[PDB]
């Protein structure tokens, strides 16, 4: 807190900056807990205030119920609330939220199958397609096709994608069968 205050009140100070990177680790550890606000101080002058925020407080604030409460409060004050009572409403909301947070902390006492089946179907059907492409008979087809033809190239070129489409159809059918097996 001392180092942060010094840094914020002397932004341009090389020695203090050097001390900052010297103390970088501690500041990084204490960053979630160091809370800053600004107030209209007793000297008729805006002042920075540094304080401590507890881990329990941050967790209770980040609970989704409190998030929904904050959203509703903001909606209310923006729409149906004026500017003269805005801070009074904000303080009332803060008090109610703080009580709810403390009560929640007090009472806090102390698809996978589908994804796996889809991955298995993908692996199996693609390995079948790879087995089809890579064979010891591929050398035999190649020795047969030592002679090129434009028509032969067109036929093989089309057949590769026809095999890809058939493999996709097999994969989709496997997906439906596996889904039915797991749901039943």
């Amino acid at each position: 807190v001392l180092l942060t205050n010094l840094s914020e009140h002397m932004p341009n100070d090389t020695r203090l900056q050097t001390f900052l990177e010297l103390a970088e680790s501690v500041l990084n550890y204490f960053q979630p807990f160091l809370g800053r606000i600004e107030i209209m101080g007793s000297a008729k002058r805006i002042e920075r205030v540094y304080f401590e925020i507890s881990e329990s407080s941050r967790t209770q604030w980040e609970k989704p119920q409190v998030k929904e409460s904050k959203r509703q409060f903001i909606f209310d004050v923006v729409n149906e609330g004026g500017e003269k009572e805005k801070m009074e409403l904000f303080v009332n909301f803060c008090e109610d939220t703080i009580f709810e947070m403390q009560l929640a902390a007090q009472i806090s006492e102390s698809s996978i199958l589908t994804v796996r089946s889809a991955l298995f179907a993908l692996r199996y059907n693609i390995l079948t397609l790879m087995r089809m492409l890579s064979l010891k008979s591929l050398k035999k087809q190649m020795k047969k096709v030592k002679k090129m033809t434009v028509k032969d190239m067109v036929t093989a070129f089309f057949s590769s994608y026809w095999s890809i489409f058939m493999t996709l159809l097999h994969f989709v059918a496997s997906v439906f069968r596996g889904f039915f097996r797991i749901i039943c």
Partner: protein, 362 residues
């Protein structure tokens, strides 16, 4: 030889990639032509046949030719998609996984959520030597190696990324390397990266647009077994034109609200069905023959089906389609029943649907 075949195959790939969109339009046009011809079937009589009532007599060969052409065009559209759009999908997936590796350590420090199909499937492409084939950054493995190797283990990081340990310094010291002939078929089969192609095929199969085009192809094939399957290709107009997409956005923008409104209507009609089944059973005789009654509310399921199917579709609600309450001791209660059904179901909920559509427009 293989150089020539690669050149001609590249020509063919580029031609299909250039003409991917023109032929989607051509397939849609052929689908309209097929369905316009389909408007000229009739049933003729055992087994009944579907026969063209053609005055000219030319329409049956035209239909056969158009069906064959539509199937061919759908196949070529799949090919054009694979040449044109698949490279961008692979590029984006490789970019995503590379950035997640370097800037998040998704496999070094974190792990996939085990319910994420993409995160679990992307494990395969990391080990592949040709991992960033489409993504420009060819140094992602080295960047991850420098970021995490010293702290997380320079051996396991290399094993995870599929980087050779001693090949680098052996080659730097004394390479002792020889050229390989491209004509060797076994050499080419070793050169092709099997695991990377497996991962790429998985990505393509998971891709939504490719699945849509495959469904289009399957429907085109089934159109030869039954010509009326070509009507399913008229659904392609929701994707062919942006002007129709503007209209359909007014429906899909608040689609979840529309579905929830339908469910709420179902619940309200169920409550009305409960009330009718408990109090107004006598009024649900829907038989004109005075001898045999046809009671639609003697069973809860029958009463709910009757309400949902008839009262909702009726202009004035359920009161239009059930026996008049005049003179009955439950007359006032049943009048309230009918009026409230009309006001809540016919007037308000349908108004909610229209309001959702109009608000989507706005």
């Amino acid at each position: 030889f293989w150089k020539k075949i690669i050149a001609y195959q590249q020509k063919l790939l580029n031609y299909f990639a250039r003409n991917f969109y023109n032929m989607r339009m051509l397939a849609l046009f052929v689908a309209f032509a097929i369905n316009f011809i389909l408007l000229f079937y009739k049933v003729s009589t055992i087994a009944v046949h579907y026969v063209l009532e053609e005055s000219s007599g030319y329409m049956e060969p035209t239909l056969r030719i158009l069906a064959i052409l539509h199937t061919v065009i759908s196949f070529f559209c799949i090919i054009g998609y694979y040449c044109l759009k698949v490279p961008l999908v692979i590029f984006k997936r490789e970019k995503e996984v590379a950035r997640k590796l370097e800037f998040d350590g998704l496999y070094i420090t974190e792990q996939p959520s085990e319910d994420d199909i993409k995160g679990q499937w992307d494990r395969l492409v990391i080990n592949t030597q040709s991992f960033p084939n489409n993504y420009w950054d060819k140094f992602v493995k080295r960047k991850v190696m420098d970021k995490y190797g010293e702290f997380y283990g320079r051996d396991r990081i290399s094993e995870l990324l599929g980087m050779d340990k001693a090949a680098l310094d052996f080659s730097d010291a004394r390479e002792k390397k020889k050229p390989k002939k491209d004509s060797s078929l076994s050499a080419v089969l070793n050169s092709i990266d099997v695991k990377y192609q497996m991962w790429k095929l998985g990505v393509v199969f998971t891709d939504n647009s490719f699945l849509y085009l495959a469904w289009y192809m399957t429907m085109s094939v089934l159109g030869h077994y039954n010509n009326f399957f070509f009507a399913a290709h008229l659904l392609d107009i929701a994707m062919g034109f942006k002007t129709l997409r503007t209209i359909l956005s007014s429906v899909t923008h608040n689609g979840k609200q529309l579905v929830l409104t339908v469910g709420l209507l179902a619940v309200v009609v169920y409550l009305y069905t409960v009330v009718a089944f408990n109090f107004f059973r006598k009024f649900y005789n829907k038989s004109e023959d005075g001898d045999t009654p046809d009671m639609k509310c003697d069973d809860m399921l029958t009463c709910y089906m009757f309400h949902m199917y008839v009262g909702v579709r009726a202009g004035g609600g359920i009161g239009d389609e059930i026996e008049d309450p005049a003179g009955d001791e439950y007359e006032i209660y049943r009048i309230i029943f009918d009026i409230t059904f009309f006001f809540f179901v016919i007037v308000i909920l349908l108004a909610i649907i229209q309001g959702l559509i109009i608000d989507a427009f706005g």
